[PDB]
Design a protein around this ligand. Structure first.
Ligand SMILES: [Cl-]
Ligand SMILES: [Cl-]
Lengths: 275, 160
């Protein structure tokens, strides 16, 4: 029987497999069989933990979707992976070094058993966004149909434009989202964040993602909202972020420093399946 | 003539760990296949004796350079891939049956020396992360390595 776990992180459901102590080969056919909720297990994504390829790393892990293709989204599943290798006794380290389809990460398991991730240093240079603007301001004006808006823009690796809203439920996500998402001044579109500041260390946020709309959890959008709120002088260097999918904790000492995102991963179940 | 009736030669394998939870990875002489030290039991020795002898002759470590943290309960077997069996040499050896030891290096790295022998089977070593051997070992040993590294993980993980 192949052992597996189900875990939930960043609002996604992972089947998680220890392929370090288990010998199993995840062909696309096996993966699709496993994705089937009546024939197999059923999952949003499959996280497979493997021995490292590099003697200075602790593990490698891969993510596969239900079609049986490998997914390479940066930081995807990192929280569940770190908690998982600890829960299963594959490691006892709190700073776990791991390679993924997108490169190498160091994940830290906090004493609260949350997982902290280095996201890099935010970039406000409009060329790097890319954003149509002559120079970087802490705030920008943009026309958006009948409306005029104020916004911050930053790159976390992908483009973000963040609006301060007075309440995320009385926020026209559905109408302003698409208009700014593909606005002229974003050559590559942008993720549109709607940030209700509750306290200097507590934000509510809804994000209209690039070409995807509303998702329950976009970690890079939480990073982005906090980064501009800080750059704009509105936020403490340690912010709780409340999204539809749950809660993230961002931390950042400002320019010259990297931004840290911290988040939970829930262990849902263990299970066996014969192949 | 140590070969059992089944054609398995009795062997010991050695997993040497340091305090940080790395394990010693040894390069086979005149090649670039890597592996843990392993060696035959001789007529008349116990597993532990063969292990200490292999340890000194191939790695240069004495009984006081290490301590035994754990050893495998039962024997682990692997079959040599059919192409590797010397069929003309009687009795024929078709595999190995191994007892494995986990050792902690208690003295410094400079006590290692892969040239205590003049017929050395290993010409180099390095520290690797604990699970890296399970991937990098030759395919016909991987099953054994997986089981061995699984059995030893709890002991190694309980090194603060
Ligand atoms: Cl996750
Ligand atoms: Cl493997």
């Amino acid at each position: 029987s192949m052992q597996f776990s189900k875990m939930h992180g960043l609002g996604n459901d992972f089947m998680v497999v220890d392929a370090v102590t288990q010998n199993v080969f995840f062909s696309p056919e096996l993966i699709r069989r496993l994705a089937d909720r009546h024939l197999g297990v059923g999952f949003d994504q499959l996280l497979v933990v493997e021995p490292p390829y590099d003697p200075e790393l602790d593990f490698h892990y891969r993510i596969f979707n239900a079609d049986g293709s490998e997914v390479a989204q940066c930081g995807n599943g990192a929280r569940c992976f770190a908690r998982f290798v600890r829960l299963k006794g594959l490691t006892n380290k709190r700073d776990i070094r791991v390679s993924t389809a997108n490169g190498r990460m160091v994940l830290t398991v906090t004493d609260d058993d949350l997982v902290r991730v280095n996201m890099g240093e935010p970039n406000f240079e409009p060329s790097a966004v890319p954003f149509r603007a002559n120079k970087a301001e802490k705030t920008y004006i943009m026309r958006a149909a009948e409306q005029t808006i104020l916004c911050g823009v930053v790159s976390m690796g992908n483009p973000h434009c963040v609006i301060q809203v007075d309440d995320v439920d009385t926020a026209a996500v559905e109408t302003l989202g698409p208009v700014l998402e593909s606005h002229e001044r974003f050559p590559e579109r942008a993720n549109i964040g709607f940030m209700q500041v509750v306290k200097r260390e507590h934000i509510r946020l809804r994000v209209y993602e690039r070409g995807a709309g509303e998702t329950q959890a976009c970690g890079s959008g939480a990073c982005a909202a906090v980064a501009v709120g800080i750059q704009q002088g509105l936020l403490a260097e340690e912010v709780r972020v409340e999204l539809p999918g749950g809660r993230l904790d961002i931390a950042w000492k400002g320019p010259g420093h990297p931004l840290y995102m911290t988040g939970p991963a829930v262990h849902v179940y263990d299970g066996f399946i014969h192949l | 003539s140590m070969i059992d009736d089944d054609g398995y030669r009795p062997n010991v394998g050695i997993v040497i760990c340091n305090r940080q939870g790395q394990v010693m990875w040894a390069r086979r002489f005149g090649q670039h296949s890597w592996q843990f030290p392993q060696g035959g039991i001789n007529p008349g020795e116990s597993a532990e004796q063969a292990m200490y002898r292999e340890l000194f002759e191939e790695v240069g470590l004495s009984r006081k350079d290490v301590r035994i943290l754990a050893s495998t309960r039962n024997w682990l077997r692997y079959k040599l891939p059919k192409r590797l069996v010397r069929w003309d040499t009687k009795p024929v050896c078709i595999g190995q049956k191994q007892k494995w030891f986990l050792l902690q290096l208690v003295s410094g790295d400079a006590e290692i020396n892969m040239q205590t022998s003049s017929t050395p089977e290993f010409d180099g070593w390095r520290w690797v992360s604990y699970w890296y051997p399970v991937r990098q070992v030759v395919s016909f040993k991987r099953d054994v390595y997986r089981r061995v590294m699984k059995e030893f993980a709890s002991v190694v993980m309980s090194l603060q």
